[PDB]
Amino acid sequence: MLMPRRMKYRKQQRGRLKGATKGGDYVAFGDYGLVALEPAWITAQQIEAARVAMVRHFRRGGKIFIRIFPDKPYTKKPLEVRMGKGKGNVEGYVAVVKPGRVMFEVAGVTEEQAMEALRIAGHKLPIKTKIVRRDAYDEAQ
């Protein structure tokens, strides 16, 4: 799917979502990118449906960069059980995404096809998106 192959611990806490992105906020790999406006946890099966869609669209195409990882585990209790009795089982993996993170990138394809393939992705994603180019993304000195 897209999960870590080793972890110190199998389950972890939930945690809040503060603003900003801290990092990941400038393009730096391909030509066109997809940036986030709303904070959310993004599941692996979403990231995938987004990946396969990208490629689907422009078959035999360029390169895609998935600049995010589902490192965080998702717990959920079996159906129709009561509370307590300790934490759930781990049922999947997600990645924490906050406003400004650049999630995806493509390179080496017609501006025409880039604009399009990125737009289809946002339809796979539970948040609001925006598309971007290659402007003052020059953090050299």
């Binding site: 900003a20 992105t21 906020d25 406006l37 195409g61 390169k63 895609i64 390179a107 000195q141």
Partner: protein, 176 residues
């Protein structure tokens, strides 16, 4: 390229950004002081300029002092600069990341390939008087195997790169 800048007393950085006037700063080993270009203007300039080419800053002293844009502090959300740093020059072999042209068409545009432009601005040393530009590299016998990097380029004597050589510059990598 030119740009009207203006002295700051150090008052209300919030007020200035809301009144169109992006704050920044100028510095070098003799003078660091505080300035406010206009967003409107700086955009036309930096979008063409960046930090491969050189700006000059006309103050209330006629002094159009020559500069390079060291650092730009972005907003994280709704991309939109907050602050600019200006490196005051004269005649010393200072650094900068002069761009590269990628003239040509590798063999990897036919047996499944794309060009990846790993590091399309490389760092170097040379006095302000000497300001090279597009340091082209030719690509044509670069198939899907591995690919060229570092010191394999076209360096005008005066140019003295500060890299390795090993830092990868480009590659020819497969399709989807």
């Amino acid at each position: 390229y030119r740009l009207k800048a203006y002295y700051r007393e150090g008052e209300k950085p919030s007020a200035l950004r809301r009144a169109g006037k992006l704050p920044g700063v100028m510095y070098n080993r003799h003078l660091n002081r505080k300035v406010y270009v206009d967003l409107v203007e700086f955009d036309k300039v930096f979008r063409q300029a960046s930090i491969h080419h050189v700006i000059v800053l006309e103050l209330p002293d006629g002094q159009s002092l020559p500069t390079l844009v060291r650092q730009v502090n972005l907003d994280k959300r709704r991309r939109r600069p907050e602050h600019v740093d200006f490196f005051v020059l004269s005649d010393e072999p200072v650094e900068m990341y002069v761009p590269l042209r990628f003239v040509g068409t590798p063999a990897g545009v036919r047996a499944g390939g794309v060009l990846q432009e790993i590091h399309r601005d490389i760092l170097v040393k040379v006095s302000p008087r000497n300001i090279p530009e597009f340091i082209e590299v030719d690509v044509s016998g670069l198939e899907i195997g591995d690919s060229l990097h570092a010191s394999d380029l076209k360096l005008p004597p005066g140019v003295e790169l500060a890299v390795s050589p090993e830092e990868t510059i480009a590659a020819v990598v497969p399709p989807e």
